[PDB]
Nucleic acid binder design. Structure first.
Ligand SMILES: CN[C@@H]1[C@H](O)[C@H](NC)[C@H]2O[C@@]3(O)C(=O)C[C@@H](C)O[C@H]3O[C@@H]2[C@H]1O
Length: 157
RNA sequence: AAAUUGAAGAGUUUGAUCAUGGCUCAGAUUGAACGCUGGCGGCAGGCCUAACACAUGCAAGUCGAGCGGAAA
């Protein structure tokens, strides 16, 4: 499987005695639409090579997230650098109500119904890190019951 | 039974960066106005300004089973 999205391309510069070496950063996200998601950030002097590098990096850095059949089990907060993300489970039909970067991550991860907001910096590179920080923080009701030595019933009763 | 199902961001400071932080934009709205354009219908709405000044007509009469009457 592995759906791969390109969140951002950006032209960066190193100043040099000559003039300016201009290069390209690519922020990509990969996942299986069913719990795995990874990001990759690649650099190169050509755009295709950056995307390629990012994709390769992404594949290696993928991570399980506990989803509730296309939504979250509970609300989560993420933070990275100055980017803060809130995401909340939603009813089916809602769609991914996330903003930029955050929606790419949620697409490939397999979230179809979520409510989001991104506070603070909306810098793609940081949002993506916050989003996957948050998706990492999610636990299934079973996991939460396992940890508290109770049953899914008793947790919710 | 139901009385809800709800939350998007982008541009712009730098050679580049990340932050901070303004500014700006996408939405919805309206007793609107203006420009261009303009077929019909239904239902609403229509001096937000000068509590400015107002021509003209009209917007509070009715009762003869209260009364003397009798203009017609
Ligand atoms: C004195 N010779 C210089 C010296 O080799 C410089 N490197 C320290 C060399 O640097 C270059 O190669 C550069 O990259 C910068 C450019 C302006 O000059 C080029 O030619 C520069 C040469 O002219």
């Amino acid at each position: 499987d592995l759906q791969e999205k390109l969140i951002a391309v950006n032209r960066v510069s190193k100043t040099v005695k000559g003039g300016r070496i201009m290069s390209f950063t690519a922020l990509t996200v990969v996942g299986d639409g069913n719990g795995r998601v990874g990001f990759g950030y690649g650099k190169a002097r050509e755009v295709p090579a950056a995307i390629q590098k990012a994709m390769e990096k992404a594949r290696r850095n993928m991570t399980t997230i506990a989803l509730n059949e296309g939504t979250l089990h509970h609300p989560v907060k993420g933070r990275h650098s100055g980017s803060k993300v809130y995401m909340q489970p939603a009813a089916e039909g809602t769609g991914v109500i996330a903003g930029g970067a955050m929606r790419a991550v949620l697409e490939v991860a397999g979230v179809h119904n979520v409510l989001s907001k991104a506070y603070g910096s909306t810098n793609p590179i940081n949002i993506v890190r916050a989003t996957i920080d948050a998706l990492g923080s999610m636990k299934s009701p079973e996991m939460v019951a396992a940890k508290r030595g109770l049953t899914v019933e008793s947790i919710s009763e």
